[PDB]
Write a protein that binds this ligand. Structure first.
Ligand SMILES: Cc1cn([C@H]2C[C@H](O)[C@@H](COP(=O)(O)OP(=O)(O)O)O2)c(=O)[nH]c1=O
Ligand SMILES: Cc1cn([C@H]2C[C@H](O)[C@@H](COP(=O)(O)OP(=O)(O)O)O2)c(=O)[nH]c1=O
Ligand SMILES: [Cl-]
Lengths: 135, 134
């Protein structure tokens, strides 16, 4: 509804195509595109929140299980369709689990990588969330 | 004239990561990100040049054979690594062939989809180039 994006998909005799356009079918300007591949092991990814960064996760091949925690409710979704994007706004703790061996996870981000824009401690995230609330 | 971009790749026990940043490891601002998947058939694609659009092609899974023609030289390059991008500037004809069944082709574009920016006839592409040349 608010976080799951169903992109329009073109299908023809040659295959399938999806086009994501900044500020068109995604709410922000794209500054970075990163992707995860050649995955292995049973240790997950993520476990942090951002203060300003906006992202849209898309599973281009295989599947992956994503968890979002906005400090109020926890949501979970299994991404396994390239036509499905998951919006991860600022102030949202997130985690990525169960990457299939053939998984390819693509992320569209509103800004360049920035080590300082991370909240890696859950309690801190929680605190952070509390403060924002007050305001 | 080289068009291959080798991206820095992060590796750990969990897998690999590559990060593309507009105007940082690619020469333009990204306005669109499109991808081709669930491919079939024996028909190749592309077979056009753009007048304004700049793009970076990346084979995120499987493989595919790309043909680039800049009007000076024709280059055939097989993409089978997510860490390699192929820069397709304006006025550059491109074709994509031999898509693996599990292929995933991702493209970073400098602008929104625009059918009017498609030069669809090789001869016209060549004429366009000639024009540019003078
Ligand atoms: C997401 C991202 C990470 N990185 C770097 C930062 C680290 O050195 C490495 C991995 O970052 P990341 O994998 O997100 O951090 P963590 O190990 O805490 O889960 O890749 C970039 O250079 N660019 C990016 O866009
Ligand atoms: C590349 C792209 C294609 N499309 C559509 C146009 C076509 O209907 C289809 C395939 O486009 P494309 O292969 O570029 O054109 P063509 O098949 O004529 O050679 O996908 C978009 O809607 N947005 C995009 O960003
Ligand atoms: Cl579900």
């Amino acid at each position: 509804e608010n976080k799951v994006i169903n992109f329009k998909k073109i299908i023809d005799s040659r295959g399938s195509l999806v086009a994501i356009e900044e500020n068109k079918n995604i709410p922000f300007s794209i500054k970075r595109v990163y992707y995860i591949f050649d995955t292995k092991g049973e240790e997950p990814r993520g476990f942090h929140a951002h203060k300003k960064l906006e992202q849209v996760l898309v599973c281009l091949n295989g599947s992956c299980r994503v968890i979002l925690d906005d400090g109020n409710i926890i949501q979970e979704i299994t991404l396994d369709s390239p036509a499905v994007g998951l919006y991860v706004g600022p102030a949202v703790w997130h985690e990525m689990h169960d990457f299939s061996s053939d998984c390819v996870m693509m992320v569209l981000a509103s800004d360049y990588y920035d080590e300082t824009d991370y909240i890696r401690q859950y309690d801190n995230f929680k605190k952070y969330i509390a403060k924002i609330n007050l305001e």
